UniProtKB/Swiss-Prot annotation:
Source organism (scientific name): Hordeum vulgare (Barley)
EC number: 3.2.1.1
Binding, Ca(2+) 1: 92, 139, 142, 149, 184
Keyword Kinase attributed: no
Residue positions binding substrate: 45-47, 52-53, 178-183, 207, 209, 227, 234, 271, 277-279, 290, 296, 375, 380-382, 392-398, 402
Site (Transition state stabilizer): 291
Protein name: Alpha-amylase type A isozyme
GO CC term, one of those recorded: extracellular region
SUPFAM superfamilies linked: (Trans)glycosidases (SSF51445), Glycosyl hydrolase domain (SSF51011)
Residues at the catalytic site: 180, 205
Family indicated by similarity: Belongs to the glycosyl hydrolase 13 family.
Chief localization: secreted
Keywords: Calcium, Carbohydrate metabolism, Germination, Glycosidase, Hydrolase, Metal-binding, Secreted, Signal
Length: 404
């Protein structure tokens, strides 16, 4: 059994009294709903309020979400309810505390007294010329515009970053990682950090655009999009690795499929169309996150169909991730908890078997592990396709679940 929960949104850092202190009050509900792991925001000092422009990586106390004590206390309360804590790991780029001779900020401070992470411009990807001293290796991945990109090929970098990651585990209690902007560096570099710190999982944010066409809708075929993600996992180590990816292929396809185009939910081989259908043990599915949804709304799930999205991900193979706002702010708490209870009581996991029974415009129906049948779409009756022995288990706006 595995169910993730994103424990923040783009606005969390503004929570009065502190985001982590507030969350202390949400732990019991999260645990009771069957959640096994909670993804928390970038914990370190960051030039940006949300945390994605990290500087003094050991300086947790400067976080806007809360200080090291509050964080340890939230993680401790999670662990007391059997729930793990995932840290949002932002290491593609980093901001320096001090300017050098050139008057450029490229003199970093790790946040401790000694020299851990007190990097110089040699640690900056030589091709991020806006900050480097041209002596480093070339960036192994894409560049982040606003801050110096770290040269992950630099040996000191690898060592001090792994040491820091192990300290987030040892001194704060984190169990796993969410790798921010994973396109920023190579899976080979990702492998170094994952292999070097044995996290229970390392879900990577590898977000590429979806092949679209003409009007703007995404194409029905998305093998290219999910091949890339599958390939990333292979290079990070495949099955031997704790590494995995957010299933952005499924996210894109589902975004469109619910708008009366559920025929999109199956590939020509009769398999789920996203990473879920090719490597479900490595697919972390979701409805919306702090970028796609929330107040940034880069790619929001149709707001009137959000529960259909959860009926899909929570009953299906792949590891589902519930979004904070959806569980707590939209009034879907009991409905979401009930879907997770169905998943759990039926022993459904990321690798459960999927048999699609109907993939039409207003009706998607599938059977999982031959124990649960779910239906999404506006079609009133799909009874003819329900196997013998199933009885309605749960239902809401345009979705239904049956169990034997
Ligand atoms: Ca220092
Ligand atoms: Ca950069
Ligand atoms: Ca980079």
């Amino acid at each position: 059994h595995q169910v993730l929960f994103q424990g923040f949104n783009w606005e969390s850092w503004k929570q009065s009294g502190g985001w982590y202190n507030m969350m202390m009050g949400k732990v019991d509900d999260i645990a009771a709903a069957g959640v096994t792991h909670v993804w928390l925001p970038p914990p370190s000092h960051s030039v940006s309020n949300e945390g994605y422009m990290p500087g003094r990586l050991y300086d947790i106390d400067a976080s806007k979400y809360g200080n090291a004590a509050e964080l340890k206390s939230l993680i401790g309360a999670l662990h007391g309810k059997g729930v793990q804590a995932i840290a949002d790991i932002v290491i593609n780029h980093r901001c320096a505390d001090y300017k050098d001779s050139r008057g450029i900020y490229c003199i970093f401070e790790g946040g401790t007294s000694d020299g851990r992470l007190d990097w110089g411009p040699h640690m900056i990807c030589r091709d991020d010329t806006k900050y480097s001293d041209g002596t480093a290796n070339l960036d192994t991945g894409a560049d982040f515009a606003a801050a110096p990109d770290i040269d992950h090929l630099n040996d000191r970098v690898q060592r001090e970053l792994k040491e820091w990651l192990l300290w987030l585990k040892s001194d704060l209690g984190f169990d796993a990682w969410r790798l921010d902007f994973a396109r920023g560096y190579s899976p080979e570099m990702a492998k170094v950090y994952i292999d070097g710190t044995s996290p229970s999982l390392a879900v990577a944010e590898v977000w590429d655009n979806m092949a679209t066409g003409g009007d703007g809708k995404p194409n029905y075929d998305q093998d290219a999009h999910r091949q890339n993600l599958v390939n990333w996992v292979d290079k990070v180590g495949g099955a031997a690795s704790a590494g995995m990816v957010f299933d952005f292929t499924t996210k894109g396809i589902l975004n469109a499929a619910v708008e009366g185009e559920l025929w999109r939910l199956i590939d020509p081989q009769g398999k789920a169309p996203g990473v879920m259908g090719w490597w479900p043990a490595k697919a972390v599915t979701f409805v919306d996150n702090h970028d796609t949804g929330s107040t940034q709304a880069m790619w929001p799930f149709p707001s009137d169909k959000v529960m259909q999205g959860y009926a899909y991900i929570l009953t299906h193979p792949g590891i589902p991730c519930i979004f904070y706002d959806h569980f707590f702010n939209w009034g879907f708490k009991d409905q979401i908890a009930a879907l997770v209870a169905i998943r759990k009581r039926n022993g459904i996991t990321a690798t459960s078997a999927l048999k699609i029974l109907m993939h039409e415009g207003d009706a998607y129906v599938a059977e999982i592990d031959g124990k649960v049948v779910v239906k999404i779409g506006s079609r009133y009756d799909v009874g003819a396709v329900i196997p013998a022995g199933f009885v309605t288990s749960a239902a809401g706006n345009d979705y239904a679940v049956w169990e034997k």
